[PDB]
Ligand binder design. Structure first.
Ligand SMILES: Nc1ncnc2c1ncn2[C@@H]1O[C@H](COP(=O)(O)OP(=O)(O)O)[C@@H](O)[C@H]1O
Ligand SMILES: Nc1ncnc2c1ncn2[C@@H]1O[C@H](COP(=O)(O)OP(=O)(O)O)[C@@H](O)[C@H]1O
Ligand SMILES: C[C@@](O)(CCOP(=O)(O)OP(=O)(O)O)CC(=O)O
Ligand SMILES: C[C@@](O)(CCOP(=O)(O)OP(=O)(O)O)CC(=O)O
Ligand SMILES: [Co+2]
Ligand SMILES: [Co+2]
Ligand SMILES: [Co+2]
Ligand SMILES: [Co+2]
Lengths: 327, 327
């Protein structure tokens, strides 16, 4: 009386940010978002549901996770057990090939992989659309890691209509790269979930964010259709700066940036000034991601090595959607 | 046929920021502001109007200023010459005891001192209120350096009704201190005037700024009446963060912060956590000012010496209003 399943999902980095939930229970977002799934960082997860288990167990990077660290996995397991009428405790064994809780989207790859493993184990036979909807319930960004390359999370207006899909770009995504500047791989002070809730509920800047996100998304789409790299980069750099601006208007205000974040951002502007087209974005933490055409990646890593070590510059290319495995 | 005059004015640091002009020609602000005039940084300026001069001359720190560097002094001289019907060129000799164009309010002390020197030389016999109105025409923050201690610039609605005045605080200002952390005394990339104009005209966050400034000012006034230091510090720290947030929503966005700015801000929060009540604010540049009660100033300088040199921690106390000199 045992059901098991496995999946691999890659991280994604948001080009147009998701920031703030319209519905906290179902993770319905205030705005639509768009990301690039990457090849460098991924999560591998197996789940086992077994009548003989006596409690839910979460093992991450070979390390048993404590009650606080398991609370959310347990929330996702409860949700999927209701969606199957399954009453069995589960064992979740996951390995993050990506720093955890550091602004490098380990919740995207991690909850996507768990959703996929659960889909397999409980024989749910979900379409990609419906697997995206389930992953959304664990972490918003995870619903986009179901797909490769460019993916859009349509905010919709209900559990049924909020989900992601691939954005065809006539192969453009394979002509691009993202260079991670690792300022700090440690666990971050304010979680993505808590930070965006504080922003929604208290930031005087949040309406400004909302009033600009759809225009940014439209221009990202026009840029894709024309493979206009400077236009893409200007939109996404400003979109990320606008998102981080919102936390300075929260009550109390806060920032995800660290000193090295600003150093890296300024350096990206120097690189542009000195003839390397590239644009930075930051998800919810201090690390800096630099969008750059593949042909300029080595140029950029060398430029940036003047201030960061080899261990701090990690390149990445477009990556695949989720991979399921019956075991 | 020569008229001469001299004045000394001290810098001020805004606790509630002025950010954005409702009228660029007359420097009427979008919101009222409140500052503390300080004893550590000041400007000394002499002006001479003489029928024999052949052009306006501006000498700053013993160095002749070029055309670009004199444009604004020339605008202030033209204005004051119209207000006297004087047709004579002038020589302005000024010494800044304060880094220039670095976010340490050298335009406040400098244009205040020039306004005072011109008042003297042309025998204008201005009340403090009217001298504040004239200094306002050279630099907004300068209209507050006419007064000592706490001073408020009332935005008014016309050249006649926009001016500053002292805020009585039952001696509280003499129980306080401000510690400057000098991250970079160099000349800054984006001027205060250009930065705030870009913000007014393009920032999606500017309305949020406007919608909160009057509430901040009110609470600063209640805190003064009760000498409530924690309440003052929380208001002013959030007000400064909100002001800097507005530039991340500008088009194109920008920041005045440098890496050391964030380091210093984080350290101030550590100091609070480890039992030293103190609060940071930043004017338009990378340097960080820390409001602190006098009794905790040495504690704080020692705490901060773990990461900054002696040459980077400059203390300051409340300072006087403008001093005029007939020569
Ligand atoms: N492999 C995983 N399986 C389950 N939950 C995970 C996994 N990796 C990360 N998480 C969850 O994601 C949280 C971090 O979420 P978030 O604050 O969005 O950070 P990040 O920048 O890593 O995406 C972790 O503390 C944990 O709750
Ligand atoms: N002593 C002075 N006399 C005249 N103008 C001055 C003086 N000191 C500074 N200024 C003007 O102020 C400008 C800096 O203004 P601002 O951008 O507000 O910088 P700050 O942070 O120093 O106040 C200088 O470039 C110059 O135009
Ligand atoms: C700024 C972002 O990186 C925030 C991602 O937040 P999460 O997707 O981690 O949050 P939850 O829905 O609470 O799990 C932008 C993005 O990934 O779209
Ligand atoms: C953020 C501030 O430091 C900006 C001061 O700007 P200025 O008074 O230098 O600007 P102008 O009116 O253009 O001369 C806040 C303040 O001093 O009130
Ligand atoms: Co996340
Ligand atoms: Co993200
Ligand atoms: Co100034
Ligand atoms: Co100022």
């Amino acid at each position: 009386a045992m059901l098991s399943g496995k999946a691999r999902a890659h991280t994604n980095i948001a080009l147009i940010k998701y920031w703030g939930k319209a519905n906290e229970e179902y993770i319905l977002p205030m705005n639509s978002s768009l990301s690039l799934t990457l090849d460098a960082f991924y999560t591998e997860t197996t789940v086992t549901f077994d009548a003989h288990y006596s409690e839910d167990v979460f093992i991450l990077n070979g390390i048993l996770q404590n009650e606080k660290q398991t609370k959310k996995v347990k929330e996702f397991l409860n949700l999927v057990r209701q969606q199957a009428d399954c009453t069995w405790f589960a064992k979740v064994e996951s390995q993050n090939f990506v720093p955890t809780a550091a602004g490098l989207a380990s919740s995207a790859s991690g909850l996507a992989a768990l959703a996929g493993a659960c889909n397999v184990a409980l024989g749910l036979n979900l379409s990609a659309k419906d697997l995206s909807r389930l992953a959304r319930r664990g972490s918003g960004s995870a619903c986009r890691s179901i797909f490769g390359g460019f993916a859009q999370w349509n905010k919709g207006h209900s559990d049924e209509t909020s989900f992601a899909e691939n954005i065809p770009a006539n192969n453009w995504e394979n002509e691009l790269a993202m260079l991670f500047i690792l300022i700090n791989d440690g666990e971050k002070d304010v979680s993505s979930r808590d930070g965006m809730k504080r922003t929604v509920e208290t930031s005087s800047f949040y309406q400004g964010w909302l009033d600009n996100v759809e225009k940014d998304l439209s221009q990202v789409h026009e840029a894709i259709k024309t493979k206009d790299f400077p236009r893409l980069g200007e939109i996404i750099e400003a979109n990320g700066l606008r998102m981080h601006g919102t936390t300075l208007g929260a009550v109390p205000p806060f920032t995800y940036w660290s000193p090295g974040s600003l150093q890296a951002m300024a350096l990206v502007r120097q690189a542009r000034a000195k003839g390397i087209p590239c644009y930075f974005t930051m998800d919810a933490g201090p690390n800096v991601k630099v969008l750059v055409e593949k042909k300029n990646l080595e140029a950029l890593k060398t430029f940036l090595s003047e201030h960061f070590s080899k261990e701090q510059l990690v390149p990445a290319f477009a990556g695949p959607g989720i991979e399921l495995f019956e075991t």
